[PDB]
């Protein structure tokens, strides 16, 4: 307790007032930790910090459903280049309307 109140982590002080167990994870995967806690209903996960992010149980549920940092950093570049991909897709959508229309007329007969 005193170590934690003098720590940068002091917001966890209300958590340790009762009995407790500290779950330590190096190179974490949270969904895997939640998997086992799911098996036992009376064994609650309360607070925590995942990579400097202080969370309640719901924050752990949120971090769990999340893909890996590799996949997220992978979709980041597509979400950022979406503006250029969309300027080109919309500038090239003008010639594809003609194709879709004429093929829509060849579809009728």
């Amino acid at each position: 307790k005193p170590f934690l109140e003098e720590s940068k982590y002091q917001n966890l002080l209300p958590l340790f007032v009762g009995h407790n167990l500290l779950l330590v994870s190096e190179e974490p995967k949270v969904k895997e930790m939640v998997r086992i806690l799911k098996g036992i209903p009376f064994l609650p996960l309360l607070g925590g910090c995942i990579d400097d992010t202080i969370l309640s149980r719901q924050g752990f549920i949120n971090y769990s459903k999340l893909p890996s940092l590799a996949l997220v950093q992978g979709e980041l570049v597509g979400g950022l280049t979406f503006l250029t991909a969309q300027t080109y897709s919309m500038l090239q959508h003008q010639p594809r309307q003609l194709t879709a229309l004429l093929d829509q007329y060849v579809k009728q007969q």
Partner: peptide, 27 residues
């Protein structure tokens, strides 16, 4: 065609976003 790419290259991200939305609304 060159002055259009050079004037598109000088716009801030918000403005090419609004530009893409206007290009979607019009065409």
């Amino acid at each position: 065609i060159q002055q259009l790419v050079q004037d598109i290259a000088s716009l801030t991200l918000l403005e090419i976003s609004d530009l893409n939305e206007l290009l979607k609304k019009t065409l």
